[PDB]
């Protein structure tokens, strides 16, 4: 029972606009809802409203990353990766500008707006755009973490950020490092690689599958580009069994970028959980991820498949 | 008076729709209020008398075709639909529900009598653009009607659909303009102003009919100006009370999409029955 | 030497229109160069230029699907899947319209133009929408097959198309299933799996391998969604290592799509020739094929590397 | 007096550039030389009179900045730059090669000067917004300079940019239309009519000055205007005959993005040659 990682980014951001005058924030007209509202109402001046225009709302952006500030945009994640995919393209990723995406409302977990704001794809679409990093916080404090980051980077940054509360994982003292990820539980069996909301239920699928004797090793990968591949290959080499899990389609996110390497690299078994190549519905967001398939249970059926398929 | 009996039921099924709108998002816990209630007038108009269409014959070619390009308004485009005989009024009771036909915003495929999924903002505009070209095209004598909110047009694709739609000589196209003031983060002239709004949409080869849009002669009025205007299309600009109906709603950007509480419910359905009471006096 | 893919579309566009009233055609002020020119002609009454404005092509495109039409819309693959990316997601995939998306110039064989018009993106974005068909073929006869059977086929497809003159592969005769691919050479010790102006390049590839004693299966897959997956399982199992070949990135396309199959069924060896995550340049289509590393040459070293990883 | 000789040297560059333009495009087999010979005498006027810039430091933070939104027109942009010295003439000789800074559409971390990667139709409008946001939060005096199609203001994201301008009060942007009226497909009346131009841009908020875009005086005069209103963005709507200075390009539709075969390189260059020295007999 943690604070949402959009409250989380939300509360980052006034601590950022405090240590750096460079730091401004932009929204399309749901500064309520993705929380740039805290920094709105610190800091008017360096807070620019664009309207319901998702488009300009990037390529301002991009012009304001050339006059010695350092952006932030926000909007939910089905108009921030989408709407705008071409401006993100063409004016920040080619010219490898220093901007900050952070998109709200991704998943399943966005709930009863239904499938026009689930975003199934984000992860897709950012993770194919050369010069963007692509990072997942799993709860608030790794939030903290990676929106402190992304603010030292020099250039394209996208944060994938939730509606709902989510439980703690990490501890207030995390360090993030693009293209580390963490082990988070160790076993020889099978690995769970997750992110996003996924990582604690990969944890209390591995309370679950040791019960029944299997242990699990449990890797958080919030840095999805660039990937930690080493960890992956060392994963595949002690359990020689991959189960990925991620509230994002099964097409080109995290199992996609997992499959990706191993297969160059050590090839293993890749059994993923995530949404089966659909759009979602209107729901509650518990309702949504047991009928969609991202429960504990469903991470603990994958591994068992995994299982049956390891040498 | 045949014509003054016609809009005295007009006002009635306006307060009826108000009245679905209010209990559906409070059952539901989440929904649009305040864009539903501002549309209610309208869509009195629009589903009871000037639209042609057939809830026994859903699919019929010729029919006029509505798009809530505003798709966040749901629950008053629900409400007129299970009024009008599309689907069971039962439907309403589950409204953003877990495998429930009532999505949040519009799926055209789950519910009879919605014509686009809509819920991005600007892109039900476009469809319409599509269907009215397509109708000219088949020369059916067939109206496309569509919903806008006044923060939606800071939407590039709706400058894009609108020149479109003039130069495509699209006069089966009547667009209207939900004019109520705010959007998410305060009113649109602070967000990001569009002012002059009537300006622009000229500009764009639009015809322009100003009207109040809680008053039903003149929205019936600017419909019949809007089908005589042959050289394109028209926007009929609808001027609006966010929240019209309900005291504590009204004018309110809170009030946007916050679900009322019980308490809220009950005290708004006694403002709307008094208001209905009073319309049973006439 | 064969015509164009875009040639050969342009000219199925009209045989199509001469059969099938219901056929529309949309472009965004590029009729001239996706060769909708050629139905733009034949057919006036039935095109409508949209200018420049590719949201707006597919909103209208979709609305115009509703109205018993079926609508080809065209533009180039960096603006058709991207700049009107969330128009495709949420008026035309959600709700399974009947919209034929014919994106022509993909890749580096746009030459000149450079960057920002080669698109190396398209088929991760198309790849990842449900209910979406991404074909891509590989001459004038398989495209000829393809834009035919996208017309007959219920719902969203992307046919990939490209700018310049490729080699015959396919024969007159050739039959397009959705979700069947094509064993074009048989061989022993590893497949190659192909797409576009690929499948030329890896038939060029076997040949050189056969001179160094390699025995390459050659498979086309322009059917990437859906993909023959038994075809894949099939070849891993005879072959045991597979190199894939895309002008495209490595990220999210056949690569990806192909590694997401066999780790999830018959982990082996996928080395993936591709755009190697970078924007393109100016140049000549062949200068840049070199410098990028999309020749036969690349997909022989391909071979090679896949060969030391086979069990 | 040094007024009329400051003019005729305008006339002297714009026909350099222009010959730049000719033999690049020629050389490449490749480029855009309709819409680049249209601006060549707008980009003379901002790079050899208007904009304060220095090619020995090109990020001086309080420089002008130009943006050509339509990123097709890059020769006449490289020829401009290149006679300004910000990088060698030399490189002209290697346009649109591969391993070659001069790419198709301009990239802004491969050549000195250039403010925005552009070619993406509508973007480099949208970042011109951006960038003017920021000088005028930093009170730079710094104008921002941007180019726009006449086919490129189809783009939504052109009057979202418009519409964003306009709110911020942006008076240190100043817009400029290659008004030509062609685009690929044919005249833009007849792909996707933007008429009535003028009326959309003051509509949309911006102070608008229609100028012959081929008259350096009003160019001159136009811009003075734009810099003197301080109250938000202005707009230079300059009527330009695509191909202007080549009789065989001028107001042809298939001289947008078609190479002179080296026979009409030597007839473009004799008639530039001879233009140029009835400007030295002024
Ligand atoms: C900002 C936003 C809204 C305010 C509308 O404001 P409006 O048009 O003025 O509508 P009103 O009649 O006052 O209720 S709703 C939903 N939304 C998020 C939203 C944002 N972007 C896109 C493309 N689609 C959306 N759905
Ligand atoms: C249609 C098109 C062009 C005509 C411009 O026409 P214009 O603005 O009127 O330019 P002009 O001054 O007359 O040369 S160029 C390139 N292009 C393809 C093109 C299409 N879409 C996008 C987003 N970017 C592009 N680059
Ligand atoms: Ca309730
Ligand atoms: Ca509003
Ligand atoms: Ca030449
Ligand atoms: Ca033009
Ligand atoms: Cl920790
Ligand atoms: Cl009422
Ligand atoms: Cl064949
Ligand atoms: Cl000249």
């Given at each position: 029972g943690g604070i949402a990682t959009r409250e989380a980014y939300g509360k980052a951001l006034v601590e950022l606009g405090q240590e750096n005058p460079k730091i401004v924030v932009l929204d399309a007209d749901l500064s309520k809802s993705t929380k740039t509202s805290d920094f709105a109402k610190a800091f008017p001046e360096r807070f620019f409203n664009m309207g319901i225009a998702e488009q300009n709302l990037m390529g301002v952006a991009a012009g304001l990353s050339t006059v010695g500030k350092i952006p932030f945009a926000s909007t939910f994640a089905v108009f921030a990766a989408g709407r705008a995919f071409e401006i993100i393209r063409n004016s920040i990723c080619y010219p490898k500008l220093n901007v900050k995406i952070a998109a709200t409302h991704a998943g399943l977990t966005v709930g009863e707006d239904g499938a026009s704001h689930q975003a199934i794809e984000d992860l897709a679409l950012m993770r194919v755009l050369p010069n963007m990093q692509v990072f997942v916080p799993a709860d608030a404090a790794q939030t903290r973490a990676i929106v402190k980051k992304a603010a030292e980077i020099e250039g394209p940054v996208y944060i994938r950020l939730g509606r709902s509360g989510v439980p703690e994982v990490f501890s207030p003292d995390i360090r993030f490092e693009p293209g580390r990820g963490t082990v988070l539980k160790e076993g020889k069996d099978v690995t769970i690689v997750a992110l996003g909301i996924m990582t604690a239920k990969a944890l209390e699928a591995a309370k679950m599958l040791e019960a029944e004797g299997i242990a699990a090793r449990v890797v958080d990968?919030?840095?999805?580009?660039?990937?930690?591949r080493e960890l992956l290959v060392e994963s595949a080499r002690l359990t020689g069994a991959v189960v990925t899990a991620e509230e994002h389609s099964v097409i080109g996110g995290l199992g996609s970028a997992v499959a990706e390497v191993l297969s160059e690299e050590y090839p293993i078994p890749v059994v993923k959980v995530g949404v089966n190549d659909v759009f979602g519905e209107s729901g509650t967001p518990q309702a949504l991820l047991e009928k969609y398939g991202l429960t504990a249970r469903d991470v603990v059926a994958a591994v068992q498949k995994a299982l049956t398929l390891k040498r | 008076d045949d014509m003054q009996d016609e809009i005295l039921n007009l006002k009635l099924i306006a307060n009826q729709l108000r009245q679905h709108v209010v209990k559906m998002v409070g059952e539901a816990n989440s929904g649009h209020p305040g864009g539903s209630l501002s549309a209610a007038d309208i869509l009195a108009v629009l589903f009871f008398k000037e639209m042609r269409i057939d809830p026994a014959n859903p699919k019929w070619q010729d029919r006029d075709r509505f798009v809530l390009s505003k798709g966040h308004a749901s629950p008053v485009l629900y409400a007129a639909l299970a009024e009008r005989g599309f689907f069971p009024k039962e439907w309403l009771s589950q409204f953003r529900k877990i495998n429930s036909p009532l999505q949040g915003h519009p799926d055209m495929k789950k519910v009879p009598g919605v014509e686009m999924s809509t819920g991005s903002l600007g892109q039900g505009f476009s469809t319409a653009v599509g269907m009215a070209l397509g109708l000219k095209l088949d020369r059916s004598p067939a109206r496309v009607y569509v919903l806008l909110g006044d923060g939606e047009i800071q939407e590039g694709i709706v400058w894009e659909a609108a020149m479109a739609a003039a130069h495509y000589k699209l006069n089966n196209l009547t667009a209207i303009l939900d004019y109520n003031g705010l959007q998410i983060d305060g009113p649109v002239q602070e967000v990001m102003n569009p002012e002059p709004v009537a300006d622009k949409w000229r500009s764009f080869g639009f015809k322009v009919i100003t009207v109040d849009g809680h008053n039903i002669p003149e929205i019936i009025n600017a419909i019949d100006a809007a089908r005589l205007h042959l050289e394109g299309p028209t926007i009929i600009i609808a001027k609006t009370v966010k929240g019209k109906g309900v005291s504590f709603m009204e004018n309110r950007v809170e009030w946007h999409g916050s679900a009322p509480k019980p308490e809220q419910v009950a005290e708004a359905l006694s403002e709307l029955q008094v208001g209905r009471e009073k319309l049973w006096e006439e």
């Open positions: 990968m919030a840095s999805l580009k660039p990937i930690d | -």
